[PDB]
Amino acid sequence: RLPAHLRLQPIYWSRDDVAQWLKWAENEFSLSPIDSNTFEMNGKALLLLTKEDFRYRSPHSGDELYELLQHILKQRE
């Protein structure tokens, strides 16, 4: 249900796309707010992080954000 620029496969997201994803997720999932620059990297890099890495970058929402990314990956072939 993403901002239109994010409807691509995540491996194609820019660093700014990742930031917009965080902003969208915080509102969509009622998350504790994080710096939208928390993951200073593009989508290809984001896909190399493990769930533990996500929790380290965001203790309050990293587990959710990781599973959200997984859920998004179920969308496109």
Domain ranges of the chain: 1-77
Token pair 């890495």 is at which residue?
A: 53
Give me the DSSP letters along 62-73: HHHHHHHHHHHH
Q: Are 3 and 20 in contact (CB under 8 A)?
A: yes
* Given resolution (angstroms): 1.7
39 neighbors 46 (Cβ within 8 angstroms): yes
What's the token pair of residue 66? Answer: 């990781």
Neighbours of 16 (CB within 10 A): 12
- 65-73: list long-range contacts, CB under 8 Å, 24+ apart: 65/22, 65/25, 65/31, 68/25, 68/29, 69/10, 72/2, 72/6, 72/10, 73/9, 73/10
Question: Which of helix, strand or coil describes residue 77?
Answer: coil
Q: Residues near 37 by Cβ (< 8 Å), separated by ≥ 6?
A: 19
H or E stretch including 10?
none
Method: X-ray
* Helix extents (H) in 1-77: 15-28, 43-46, 51-57, 62-73
